[PDB]
Amino acid sequence: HIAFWHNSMYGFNVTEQTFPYDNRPVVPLQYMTFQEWWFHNHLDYPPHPGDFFDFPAGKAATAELACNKGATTWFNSSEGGNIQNGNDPCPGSPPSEYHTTGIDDVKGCAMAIAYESDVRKIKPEDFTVFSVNQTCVWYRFTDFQVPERMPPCPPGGCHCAWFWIHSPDSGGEQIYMNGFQCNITGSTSHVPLAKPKVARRCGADPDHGKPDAVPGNCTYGAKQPLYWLQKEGNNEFDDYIAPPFYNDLYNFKDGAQNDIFVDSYPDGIPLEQKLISE
Ligand SMILES: *[C@@H]1O[C@H](CO)[C@@H](O[C@@H]2O[C@H](CO)[C@@H](O[C@@H]3O[C@H](CO[C@H]4O[C@H](CO)[C@@H](O)[C@H](O)[C@@H]4O)[C@@H](O)[C@H](O[C@H]4O[C@H](CO[C@H]5O[C@H](CO)[C@@H](O)[C@H](O)[C@@H]5O)[C@@H](O)[C@H](O)[C@@H]4O[C@H]4O[C@H](CO)[C@@H](O)[C@H](O)[C@@H]4O)[C@@H]3O)[C@H](O)[C@H]2NC(C)=O)[C@H](O)[C@H]1NC(C)=O
Ligand SMILES: *[C@@H]1O[C@H](CO)[C@@H](O[C@@H]2O[C@H](CO)[C@@H](O[C@@H]3O[C@H](CO[C@H]4O[C@H](CO)[C@@H](O)[C@H](O[C@H]5O[C@H](CO)[C@@H](O)[C@H](O)[C@@H]5O)[C@@H]4O)[C@@H](O)[C@H](O[C@H]4O[C@H](CO)[C@@H](O)[C@H](O)[C@@H]4O)[C@@H]3O)[C@H](O)[C@H]2NC(C)=O)[C@H](O)[C@H]1NC(C)=O
Ligand SMILES: *[C@@H]1O[C@H](CO)[C@@H](O[C@@H]2O[C@H](CO)[C@@H](O[C@@H]3O[C@H](CO[C@H]4O[C@H](CO)[C@@H](O)[C@H](O)[C@@H]4O)[C@@H](O)[C@H](O[C@H]4O[C@H](CO)[C@@H](O)[C@H](O)[C@@H]4O)[C@@H]3O)[C@H](O)[C@H]2NC(C)=O)[C@H](O)[C@H]1NC(C)=O
Ligand SMILES: *[C@@H]1O[C@H](CO)[C@@H](O[C@@H]2O[C@H](CO)[C@@H](O[C@@H]3O[C@H](CO)[C@@H](O)[C@H](O[C@H]4O[C@H](CO)[C@@H](O)[C@H](O)[C@@H]4O)[C@@H]3O)[C@H](O)[C@H]2NC(C)=O)[C@H](O)[C@H]1NC(C)=O
Ligand SMILES: *[C@@H]1O[C@H](CO)[C@@H](O[C@@H]2O[C@H](CO)[C@@H](O[C@@H]3O[C@H](CO)[C@@H](O)[C@H](O)[C@@H]3O)[C@H](O)[C@H]2NC(C)=O)[C@H](O)[C@H]1NC(C)=O
What Å distances lie between residue 248 and 119, 160, 199, 225, CA to CA? 30, 22, 11, 14
The phi and psi torsions of 132 (rounded to 5 degrees) equal -140, 150
- From the alpha carbon of 12, which atom of ligand 5 is closest? 38
Method: X-ray
Identify whether the C-beta of residue 248 lies closer than 8 Å to the C-beta of residue 132. no
Cβ proximity of 193 and 263 under 8 Å: no
Contact between 255 and 109 under an 8 Å Cβ cutoff? The reply is: no
Give 3-state DSSP helix, strand, coil % of the chain, rounded to 5: 15, 20, 65
Which candidate, 161, 221, 154, 141, places its Cα nearest to that of 184? 154
Domain ranges of the chain: 1-278
Distance of CA 174 to the CA centre of its chain: 13
Residue 235 Cα to ligand 1 middle (Å): 14
Closest ligand by atom to 185 CA: 4
Q: Which H or E element spans position 35?
A: helix 34-37
Give the count of beta carbons closer than 10 Å to the beta carbon of residue 208: 13
- Encoded amino acid at 137, one letter: V
Amino acid at 277: S
Q: How far is the CA of 47 from the centre of ligand 4 (A)?
A: 21
Final resolution, Å:
3.0
